[PDB]
Design an enzyme around this catalytic site. Sequence first.
Site, PDB file in Angstrom:
ATOM      1  N   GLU A 127      12.876  36.367   8.260  1.00  0.00           N
ATOM      2  CA  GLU A 127      11.904  37.514   8.479  1.00  0.00           C
ATOM      3  C   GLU A 127      10.904  36.759   9.360  1.00  0.00           C
ATOM      4  O   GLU A 127      10.215  37.368  10.448  1.00  0.00           O
ATOM      5  CB  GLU A 127      11.205  38.004   7.201  1.00  0.00           C
ATOM      6  CG  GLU A 127      12.081  39.020   6.354  1.00  0.00           C
ATOM      7  CD  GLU A 127      12.415  40.299   7.161  1.00  0.00           C
ATOM      8  OE1 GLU A 127      11.990  40.734   8.333  1.00  0.00           O
ATOM      9  OE2 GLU A 127      13.176  41.128   6.707  1.00  0.00           O
TER      10      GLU A 127
ATOM     11  N   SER B  93       4.639  51.041  13.686  1.00  0.00           N
ATOM     12  CA  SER B  93       4.050  50.242  12.854  1.00  0.00           C
ATOM     13  C   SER B  93       4.348  48.712  13.172  1.00  0.00           C
ATOM     14  O   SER B  93       5.004  48.479  14.226  1.00  0.00           O
ATOM     15  CB  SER B  93       4.572  50.506  11.268  1.00  0.00           C
ATOM     16  OG  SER B  93       6.244  50.016  11.605  1.00  0.00           O
TER      17      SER B  93
ATOM     18  N   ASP C  58       5.124  44.640  11.318  1.00  0.00           N
ATOM     19  CA  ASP C  58       5.420  43.801  10.143  1.00  0.00           C
ATOM     20  C   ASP C  58       4.422  42.646  10.263  1.00  0.00           C
ATOM     21  O   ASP C  58       4.427  42.081  11.341  1.00  0.00           O
ATOM     22  CB  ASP C  58       6.891  43.463  10.231  1.00  0.00           C
ATOM     23  CG  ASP C  58       7.663  44.557   9.975  1.00  0.00           C
ATOM     24  OD1 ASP C  58       7.363  45.664   9.486  1.00  0.00           O
ATOM     25  OD2 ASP C  58       9.282  44.307   9.985  1.00  0.00           O
TER      26      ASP C  58
END
EC number: 3.2.1.17
Length: 129
Positions: A35, A50, A52
């Site tokens: 990630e 959005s 992260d």
Amino acid sequence: KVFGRCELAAAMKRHGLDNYRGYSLGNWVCAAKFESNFNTQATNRNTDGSTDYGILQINSRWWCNDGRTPGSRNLCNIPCSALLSSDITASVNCAKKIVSDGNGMNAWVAWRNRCKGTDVQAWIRGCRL
Ligand SMILES: [Cl-]
Ligand SMILES: [Cl-]
């Protein structure tokens, strides 16, 4: 902060992620590698607008507030900038809520596509812990 692999494993374990919701420590380290490459400051915009944030790329559509994701919830009740800190406490507390939401670690698409079913213990190999 760019964490070392074992450095992050020890932090995650101290904060109670090892076997949280039945997911072993290697699963969480593997998710963080893919990630964020272990970088607490990582931010990535999603196609739905959005963003992260942090070591576990927690999304602003549901979990944190960044003030620019219309229709958003802030279920971890935290500014998204607090997920970028060198101290991973907020990210871990929020990740516990995410993994408890119903679909386990499949909430992290990178975990499902790159970690799920693999030898995740390799990620804690050599670590004292
Ligand atoms: Cl493991
Ligand atoms: Cl599960």
